[PDB]
Subunit: 30 residues, 4 copies
Amino acid sequence: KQIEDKGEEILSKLYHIENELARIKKLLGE
Amino acid sequence: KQIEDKGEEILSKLYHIENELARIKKLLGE
Amino acid sequence: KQIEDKGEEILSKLYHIENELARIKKLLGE
Amino acid sequence: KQIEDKGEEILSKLYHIENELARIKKLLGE
């Protein structure tokens, strides 16, 4: 359950990261 | 294998992040 | 717990990626 | 060993990603 909690935690950061990069790509295209 | 399954899903996110970075590096003319 | 240990190391990388994105978003004046 | 191999694989992508972002930050600062 530690390994499963770390797993989710990792995913949720990755969603945050992919959103920051989408925001960068959007800016740069404007 | 829930954990195996998570591994794969995490990696998938990483590929997609790599696609975003390729888009970004093109916009920055590098 | 080698796998637990890996989890933590992965997360650490994600934080650092987040620091880089904060630096990048400042350089892009966003 | 599948979980341990996925672990390494994830790390190695993250190193690639942190390098792409360092290259972005360097460019933008030049």
